[model samples]
Target chain A: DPLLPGFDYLTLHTSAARLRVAVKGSGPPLLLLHGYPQTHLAWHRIAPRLAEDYSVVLADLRGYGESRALDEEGADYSKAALARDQLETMGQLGFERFAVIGHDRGARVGYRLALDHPQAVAAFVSLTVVPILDNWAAVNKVFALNAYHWFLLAQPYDLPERLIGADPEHFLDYTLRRMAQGRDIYHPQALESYRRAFRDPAVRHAMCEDYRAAVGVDADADQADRDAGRRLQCPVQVLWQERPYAAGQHPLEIWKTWAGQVEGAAIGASHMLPEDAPDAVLEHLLGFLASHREALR
Target chain B: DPLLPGFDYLTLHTSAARLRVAVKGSGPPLLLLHGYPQTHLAWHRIAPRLAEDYSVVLADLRGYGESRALDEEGADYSKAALARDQLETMGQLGFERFAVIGHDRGARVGYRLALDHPQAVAAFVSLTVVPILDNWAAVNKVFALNAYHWFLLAQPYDLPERLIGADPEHFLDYTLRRMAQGRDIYHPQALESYRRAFRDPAVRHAMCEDYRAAVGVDADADQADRDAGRRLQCPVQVLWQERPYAAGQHPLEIWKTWAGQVEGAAIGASHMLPEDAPDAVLEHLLGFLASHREALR
Candidate 1:
């Protein structure tokens, strides 16, 4: 689309699934992974600018946007599997090592990639997420109330599928609107694109599987890493909204426990920070990515 | 209605809303409260037998079954508010004090009633539930996965309402079947009754409200009591299903923290213990009630 006018859109078949990716720019490679209930379009406002200095790659995580995956018990949807999709996608694009910037669910995959294949992810920037284990450990009434969809989408099988599938468009719009704090920040085109993709039954089912994996397999993976004292070899940056959801819990402090070198700051935006505050997100991204530019070598 | 034979069905106008109640037999009054996605019908298997020995009153909690309450921000659906509905229903029926037997969501209301109006509740029986604050405190990934509906139903209004309203029947059936561990335990007639009541848009919205209240107002109320060092004064008996959901977590030990005199046992059943193991449920109920016979005086 017109939103990312210069970016080339293509489908790349990974080992386990097919992922839709958008590419542009010409220098060091950087992958942009979008969050849930949205697509690569979530980075439309900032991708073009980033493309100026870095070969920005935007790929819809499998089961979201145009990407596709097997709809099963989430074995294939775990971040481990999703991180593999990214590794394979980047390898196919002729980039063995690349910087990774992920938002929400994508951030989940970003950290997992850094943890699983330290050499593949040159640098990692996680937007609005910590490790899955940390997320679960911090769950309380406030967290459960604010981030309820975590539980809803992770519910066993068709319970969430049937409920959400009843009216996918409404669910999509409602989720987008709510996450943006009722502000009209999303591009009409991006919102409609999300609506279209979310309308697919398989996509919705796969989304649930993604979360199911997070609660079980993905969490176990994180815990295993923690028990073994495995930390991200690459530099890590976390960005989060200054909402009550993260009130007392320091996201940066939490990340430090998982990574040896962790740094981030809270921004005055909603969960959908890229669209809500594109400039702020870009500034932080550029600063972090430039500091780790040696990874591009 | 045929499921509850020899019972008189009447609408009792409480202080705030109208409630449909089924009353049968005669002696010491015993109010029976049913859980979510079901109605007074949930007590069909046990209510009739209980009626033989005590004056059994089966009333749907407000916003469930035939009970009607205003649709708002869950202010009206809080267990405190629901407890009031029960207390008023009993008062209108000319009973000053009575015993209570509750299952699931109804059990939530039961404990709240006992905590709020200890004098009115002679003895309390909770089936498959603990106090709201304790439940929140004990939440983990396991609890979130198994009891996802707590978060789903409590989601901000219109989202859950619209989704669940899309196919209330399907949602209701899925809930019953899953909670019963895929067992054909529910009586066909009672299941049909639940399906019919759940199909109503108002009922579905009210259900969301009930959960919303639990996450906020209800949980806060419970916390307020706990902080004030308040505990249930009435004799309490807790019954739970022996499932992984409660594995390693002793419900009896948990209840002991919330009440002065609490005793309970785990039965071989699903979350739908009252229906999945009605005979066992009755045996526990009779034994507990017999031991607290002085409460009925």
Candidate 2:
């Protein structure tokens, strides 16, 4: 496949699954992942800057964006599935090692990716996500508040999905739109694009499956990590917003358990870190990449 | 002729306006003005508490819930019209003097009610409001940041509203639902009730007219106040959330011209001052009422 301006679709097949890649810029290889209700477009912020020093490859994971969208035949959007997808996608793209940074949903998979494919990923940058598996705290206070959707989304489909999916009015746009703190995180047109992506039933099911995976297979893997004394092989960087839990309860020290080396900072915004403070986030990304795996440049 | 079991609707009729006043308790009368996207039920939080020692009369402002629904014409949801409606409701309910407290849109009308009918309104309490006149400076950096609706709603009709209205998946509810920044601020049943109230063609038209009036007549009134150097006569209390530009600039000076004996305070919460921290709000209201008009009690 030939390179295109900005980003273009590149499909590389692995033995287990077909990986979708949007290859941009040329230098060394760098792998990027996306979040919920979005695609590889999540890292559009610093792609150019990173591309200057390293070849940048942003992938819409197996179930997300233009990758092989996941179907809800009960295939959980499991971390294993997602983690394998990224590693295999990079391998197919001719990258044996690269620094990977993931945000929100992507960061969950990144943790597992660093675990299952230690030699494959040399460094990790985790943005706005915490380990869901370490102890696996149940549905609790702030989590129950409205991010209650995390637990709600994990349920078997047809019941909750149907109620929301069936509602012609207050379904996806409503959910995605509220993801924005206000207009700052999501522009009206940007929301429309996300809505357009969700129109595909497979994408919706995959999103739901992703939730189910978090509750089951993901949770089990997380438990296995706790039991096995698993630790990251590469440097790990964690970035979070200013939630009370982000600072008070689960600080960098708590996150340090997952990685051999950990550096974390809580930003001064609500959630929607990507859309709200992309600049500060990009600066952090570059700093992390420079700090670890200097060979990539 | 008879009150509903477990509910009371005190009906009163003047020559032009027939009003339903939900009255409870007895001491000094406190006329509570309910705001936009809500009926008099918005007062459900503070009314009963104030009712302990005051005659709390909660009237669904015209074009809202129970009060004669506003028409799709000029007189529809205009604060002047709702103020007139509430004024008429008071006349028939046999109250010649009262204290008024309103939030959001209700507070807008209350400002005018006290201005136009100074004799009837003994004291004024504006909770989470800005002087329409002072609103020219409202959409500054802070407002341009959070609480984005002032601009979203202020757009000319059919553009923003139509696009947002035609949203096949309702993003507005997603937004308005979390708008209070707290989930309970919008009770599900109450949301349904508000949706039903909003669905009416007349109500939609009236709401648009309310903003339209803000851009037009409300703007004019603000300018006129600046010109005439009008200051408030009755004792006034302005309660605000400790949010960025949530109180707007010049809080003390804005009302200084209008409010004779003015006082104010800022509480820690989002824009929904009453809902997020109810106990604090109730304390504020109880104190505001007691201190301002010791004579009435």
Candidate 3:
């Protein structure tokens, strides 16, 4: 009832946590990963349309939405851990390999998944974020100032949790609104769902822990991969918001450093691509998938 | 009652805003500038001890603690504005030249004051943090992760303000505790004072504006100063905590690029230098000041 009326809700259990997944349509599986402070509903506008051609799997990554919060140790909330959950969930659901399209924090998870489990991902679509290693490398005045939340939520544990928990609704509203430059791109129901999830103290704590893990433990893994010359083997496409961060350098060149076959373009929207500019986002996504259909199998 | 007894709390007005100053001791003037989420009391332990040899003046920087918050426009809370206020305040107090020692955000002001008003500052002691331009240039994974506040506080206004204001006391406590690696290094009175100041919504707004200005407007000023090849002519001494930041490189080498005749050493303490190890901090201060006694005239 909380999700779209037609889609079937799923409770997929992994070794570390229980994940909430929503499935629709029937074709090649294409996993949909949403960003921070948001549920899988972020893909509602795009996924329903994509479902006609592909079995769209919209999932709330661990510590987000209906997904169960796990222990903060062992980098449980890390992108690598989150990737493992998705992979196992897919395996349990009888899919050996699936394509992934992620936005924001989901983009981070997307790249990590592709890098760590290249065998499981056929094609990867990253929206609105550079990979963790490149992101740290690109830390300057502009990036640091604009993407301040990357650091804020990554603070040592309960600091960000307590602050966000004080007025979860306000924090959620502020986060969504600010990201879109004070414009509302989210549907009313989807926004409500996000607010509902954020209101939970456990969820807030998990969210902070997720970010903390990303910058701390996950960063270590990223470095190890980089040192060992680990690169994304699958076809990769990066869709970035056309904003100030895109001013200095082309994102494609940056992505090419981490990914082998990289293709990206600036989306005419804010960071919230799927919701803000759904038509264009869908067009780009479909076009890319169609071109890579042979390799996707 | 908030600060240590015996220091005279004075309200000094400048062209920008009114400043709350705590003055004690004798001999030559040595201005003490406090950092973020803390009042002038951050210097209580160190200033009083140094007062035996010098005229220690503890004052809150603009938009923090007891200091007056200025308008958000024109980078009012930037270190440039703070330097001007301190210069005017010292001039009004009948000191044309003074030695400056600042920590954290205050350390930023210390270097800025030395750079912009070289005639007014006889010597400078920057505790923690490199110059704004240099700091941005030296961005790496560890620095970005540890000095995350440099970015978080610099977010566009109202985002950080509302979040911090949600639970000001918790945020302040978290900042202090996290900086010390989960250890208490603050006096109960000092901690209480920080909590009291942060509890005010106006202070929270001011704090955000201060950071916003730092990244946007203040960064511009720093870049401009660099472009103009304006260097600090005053005797410079840097004392940084024995943390990961101070590792792998000589801070004196980094400071030398911005200042002439630079001297620095690692302290056996955390970021909260004065409170954590007041003796060592004082020893470094006295040694540096005495060595530059001719410049202190």
True contacts kept of each: 0.72, 0.00, 0.65
DockQ of each: 0.67, 0.02, 0.54
Off by over 4 Å in 1: A70-75, A243-249, B70-75, B243-249
In candidate 3, list every pair of residues with a backbone clash: none
Model 2 chain B: ten consecutive residues of lowest lDDT: B139-148
For model 2, residues B1-297, the per-residue Cα lDDT tens digits are: 112112357766644444557888777888888776667666665666777788778876665665554232345455767777777777677787788888888888888888778788878888778687666545332233233344444545543344334432244365564557645675555566667666655455455567667766776776776688766568888888775544437565567767768888887776665556668888877887777666454
Q: How does model 3 score by TM-score?
A: 0.87
Look at candidate 2 and give me any clashing residue pairs: A28-A55, A169-B170, B63-B70, B231-B257, B231-B258, B232-B258, B232-B259
C-alpha RMSD over true interface residues, model 2: 14.7
Q: Model 3, B1-297: lDDT tens per residue?
A: 345657888998778887899888888899998887788988877887788888888888886787785454543677888888899889888898999999988888888888888898999998886776676666665666677777776766666677777766777887888777766778887788888889987777777777776667677888888899888898889998785545435577778878878898899777788788788888889999999888888
- Residues A1-297 of candidate 2 have per-residue lDDT tens digits of 112246756887655445668787766677878788777665655565677777888877676665663342555468888888787777777788877878778888888888888887788787777777632453332233345355445545543354345542355655555666544566455455566656666676677778777767887888788789988888888888776664434758667777768897877765667667778887887787777656453
TM-score of chain A of 1: 0.96
Compare the candidates by lDDT and give the number of the best one: 1
Model 2 CA deviation exceeding 4 Å by range? A1-5, A15-18, A69-72, A167-170, A187-192, A246-248, A295-297, B1-297
> By DockQ, is 2 or 3 better?
3
Off by over 4 Å in 3: A1-5, A13-16, A69-75, A111-119, A220-234, A243-251, A254-265, A295-297, B1-6, B69-75, B181-184, B243-249, B291-294
